[PDB]
Amino acid sequence: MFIQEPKKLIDTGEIGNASTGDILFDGGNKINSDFNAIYNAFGDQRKMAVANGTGADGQIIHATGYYQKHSITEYATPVKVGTRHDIDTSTVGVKVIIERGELGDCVEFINSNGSISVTNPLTIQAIDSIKGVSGNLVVTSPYSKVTLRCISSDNSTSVWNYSIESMFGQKESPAEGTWNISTSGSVDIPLFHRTEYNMAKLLVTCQSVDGRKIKTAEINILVDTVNSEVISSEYAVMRVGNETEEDEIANIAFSIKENYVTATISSSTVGMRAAVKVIATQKIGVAQ
Amino acid sequence: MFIQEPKKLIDTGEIGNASTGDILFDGGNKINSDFNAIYNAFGDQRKMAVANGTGADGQIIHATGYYQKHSITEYATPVKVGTRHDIDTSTVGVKVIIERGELGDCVEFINSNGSISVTNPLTIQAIDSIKGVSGNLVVTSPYSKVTLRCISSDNSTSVWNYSIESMFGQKESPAEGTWNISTSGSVDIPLFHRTEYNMAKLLVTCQSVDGRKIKTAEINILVDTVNSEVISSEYAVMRVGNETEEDEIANIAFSIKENYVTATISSSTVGMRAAVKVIATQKIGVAQ
Amino acid sequence: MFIQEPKKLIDTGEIGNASTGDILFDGGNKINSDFNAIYNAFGDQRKMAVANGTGADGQIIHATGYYQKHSITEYATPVKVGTRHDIDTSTVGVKVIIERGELGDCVEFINSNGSISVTNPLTIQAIDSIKGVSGNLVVTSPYSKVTLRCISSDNSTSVWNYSIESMFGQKESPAEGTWNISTSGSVDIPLFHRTEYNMAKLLVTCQSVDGRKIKTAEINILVDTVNSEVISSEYAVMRVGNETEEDEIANIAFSIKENYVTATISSSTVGMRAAVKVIATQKIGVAQ
């Protein structure tokens, strides 16, 4: 691997005190050291084996950043904080060790070839320990993204915590916000175009400006494109200042309006607010 | 657009072999080429039309990184791997093509002005193909973030996969971990301050140290700030080593303790562990 | 704090017009200005108090990027766009102000020491305003990541929107895609190894190639490792072109096959597609 050297700056404090030969060699090497540190942090380090990362197929600065691809032997020694790794466990699981960190230090991993599995796992050991984990963190989720962050350093108290998430997938939320139920006692909230999703899941919480009346419900909806309708299943309904155990506080209906799956929120109680949030969706794609 | 040139390094191998005129011109241009590559990867490229990205309103290095704003004509030719784009489809949908990549290569998109829609979509074509997609990827989610990653290159097998997520929204989880049910047979788990959310959704899985007794349940809770209470709706309950089809394995209750919405987990079975995870929340904000 | 100066480039347009003394001093300072701008955007700025970020414990380029740790007094003045902050509110809440931005500008925050709370909050004021927020954004979620983005600038119309998410936690999805129900009328979809999770939540939507028959359901499953089985709870079922209100359109079963929790989708209707997506999981870890 390439272990950069800290930042070096040109000592302009000299020059009319050391001739042109020494300042260009002590300056050049300094400029080549820094850039190398920058290009290897945002570029493929494997290219250093050529013209020192130069040439036509040389190193470039990836705006998206870069995740280095190292070998087993290289991971035999603790990795430096701030590095990025694209793990490959196709032939065998790989063990990565992170040097002791300080508050905020970070190391990130990805698995572009999706080799991570239970037989060929990604084992991570963060010098000292990882919260909620006894020993090493064993990652078995293919195509994942792992982020490790030091949440405590001080003296020996060098503890880390982590997050693991999928590199891919449709995770967006087509709608999230708060709307007022107009004086007319009804409000339309467009969620998404009829062609965007087959089903969605949302959370709806209606509350009076005073806070004495409140209702929340979870609703799953199915888009019936053929009949231009939307089926819904409202459950886990909870109410507080409901004057009666009958129809109450706020009603939620669905349909397609202007070609947009839409939520219609109505209420008898004047001055009602309604928070709507889509927390999940499913879209039928192409098999395989 | 600005298409950077690979990394260039100063040939200190010369100097006391080529006078000061040539090494400063061949060196300078080299230093201006690299920096330009770095500033345009982390800065607004549109500024290159001025003093070459210099001056008072010149280019700067964004720690948050930067997402270039290009024109239709510029996107007429395949984009380089590692680039970032802030799409604008307000006047019409825009088609972006990505050059053939290699394992790990990445291109990211965002939609700051939220112009992306079904009529003005973001069409992405990744040289060769995108997994689970027949043809181009058609993005219609406004204010989204799209990440494309090459999961296979080798020879022609240059396939990509993607993720799409919302740029905005409250997605945090106020609590996630595992707690022991004390010998007393009860444990309190603070979830969040009473003022942080109106409703939350959590997953609770209790299992004996031996693994013969286990229960999981999904619970939606509503915060009643006025009465300082919390309503809950527990469903999809599943149990395994339940000695009876009556009350069993573990009970989950909610309330406000020390001003924190809290989960109280109790069980008759000695040596029980309880994993609690909040997977969704809703907070009434200000309309519009 | 360190407020960088815009990009500076070496004026090769001179040299055989200004002797070696002036071009090295005007060039050097230029090279030290740029690098400093780069290292402070991707490195600990607190080190500038030493050998100007040099030496053994000098500044380095973090591939993962870096989040600066500033003081209360420093945050007394508006922060520059593109900066990153690791907030510390252990002693008291901290107020951060962001200078007026332009479309796409971004500022990101993290909370490595998890000091953020309702008593010691992170208050953010984005010059002009933040959508859906009246006044300042008050963040009380510990160990969070806050991203602010300008979604509109033009003249005075400088509005921002935000996202807030947990720095840590298991958020991955072990499976998401679309599969064809083979002519045999049944398809097996492996979700994850039996040891990866105790419970999972998934969304399943089956639709005929023509679109007249469609069903969606939400299912929570519990992994019974001891008996090598999987309990499931299917609910919120919705159907459209169901010829009868009896068993219909598609059945979903679960079990362990080849040591992988697996979903078996079957249907009488020929030519059926089935989208499966795991949207939540829970894994019992180690207490504390």
Swiss-Prot record, chains A, B, C:
Induction / repression: Expressed in the late phase of the viral replicative cycle.
Coiled coil segments of this chain: 20-80
Any one Gene Ontology BP term: viral release from host cell
Location of this chain's protein in the cell: Virion
Primary location group: virion
Pfam families recorded: T4_gp9_10_C, T4_gp9_10_N
Keywords, alphabetical: Coiled coil, Viral baseplate protein, Viral release from host cell, Viral tail assembly, Viral tail protein, Virion
Domain of life, source organism: Viruses
Quaternary context: Homotrimer. The gp9 trimer interacts with the long tail fiber (LTF) that comprises gp34 trimer, gp35, gp36 and a gp37 trimer. Part of the baseplate macromolecular complex which consists of gp5, gp5.4, gp27 (central spike complex); gp6, gp25, gp53 (inner baseplate); gp7, gp8 (intermediate baseplate); gp9, gp10, gp11, gp12 (peripheral); gp48 and gp54 (proximal region of the tail tube).
Free-text note regarding domains: The C-terminus is bound to the baseplate, and the N-terminus coiled-coil domain is associated with the long tail fibers.
Physiological role: Peripheral baseplate protein that is part of the tail fiber network. Connects the long tail fibers to the baseplate and, after virus attachment to a host cell, probably changes its conformation to trigger the signal for tail contraction. Involved in the tail assembly.
Name of the protein in its database record: Baseplate protein gp9
